[PDB]
Amino acid sequence: QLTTESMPFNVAEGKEVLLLVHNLPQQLFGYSWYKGERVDGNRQIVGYAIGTQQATPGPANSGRETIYPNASLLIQNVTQNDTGFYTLQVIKSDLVNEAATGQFHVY
Amino acid sequence: QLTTESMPFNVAEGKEVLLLVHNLPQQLFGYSWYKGERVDGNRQIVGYAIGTQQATPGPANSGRETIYPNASLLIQNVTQNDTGFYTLQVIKSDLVNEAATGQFHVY
Ligand SMILES: CCCCCCCCO[C@@H]1O[C@H](CO)[C@@H](O)[C@H](O)[C@H]1O
Numbered sequence: 001q002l003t004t005e006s007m008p009f010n011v012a013e014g015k016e017v018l019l020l021v022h023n024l025p026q027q028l029f030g031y032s033w034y035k036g037e038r039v040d041g042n043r044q045i046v047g048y049a050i051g052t053q054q055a056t057p058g059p060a061n062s063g064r065e066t067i068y069p070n071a072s073l074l075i076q077n078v079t080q081n082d083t084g085f086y087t088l089q090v091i092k093s094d095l096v097n098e099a100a101t102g103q104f105h106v107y
Numbered sequence: 108q109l110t111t112e113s114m115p116f117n118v119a120e121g122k123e124v125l126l127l128v129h130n131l132p133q134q135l136f137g138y139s140w141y142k143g144e145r146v147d148g149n150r151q152i153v154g155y156a157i158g159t160q161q162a163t164p165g166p167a168n169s170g171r172e173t174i175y176p177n178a179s180l181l182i183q184n185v186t187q188n189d190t191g192f193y194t195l196q197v198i199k200s201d202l203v204n205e206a207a208t209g210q211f212h213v214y
């Protein structure tokens with residue numbers, strides 16, 4: 001089962017957090033991260049294609065995030081606006097996609 | 108701007124409806140249709156890989172739908188359960204994705 005978790009879970013303003021990703025499925029094309037609890041184009045942070053290793057920003061991209069080839073997302077110089085939920089959609093080769101939501105809490 | 112519309116808009120129970128799709132972006136991996144107004148894995152009707160022209164059913168597939176290469180969705184022998192909103196997500200080759208919602212009304 002695809003899941004994500006934040007390290008750390010409670011994050012001091014101005015520090016760093018890594019969203020770790022567990023149990024990627026076999027046979028995927030790539031990753032799409034979104035701010036909030038659902039898949040929503042208007043809140044897309046980044047898209048990443050695992051075949052070319054290319055990252056492309058979406059409308060909610062801050063410039064402070066880095067995605068890794070295993071879909072883990074690093075956020076640096078974390079702000080109040082970064083707090084709360086994130087949603088990872090994994091795009092499967094058959095287009096029957098999977099999603100996981102995680103969160104962290106800025107203080 | 109990606110949009111969809113139903114032909115016909117008001118559809119008699121037991122007849123047929125075609126969801127037409129306008130203004131697909133270029134450079135696409137595939138299409139995913141969902142029942143309702145959002146992208147939600149539990150309500151996915153079909154996923155379609157453009158590279159192979161191959162359709163795979165999701166959990167909401169009824170067996171009465173057919174999807175075409177330009178993302179149009181035909182539904183035959185329409186039921187009451189088919190009424191209302193449908194959402195199409197288009198997966199671009201950069202994994203920055205677009206969605207459009209439409210509806211039809213069964214009587
Ligand atoms: C600056 C730190 C760079 C982070 C590099 C990628 C870290 C990813 O690390 C990987 O995380 C996966 C999800 O993250 C976990 O499932 C794995 O245990 C781990 O191998």
Ligand SMILES: CCCCCCCCO[C@@H]1O[C@H](CO)[C@@H](O)[C@H](O)[C@H]1O
Pocket residue numbers: 125127128129130175177179181
């Ligand atoms: C019974 C068989 C149904 C025919 C399925 C193919 C119909 C595809 O529908 C398409 O929607 C587009 C909207 O831009 C139009 O521009 C295309 O020309 C139209 O054919």
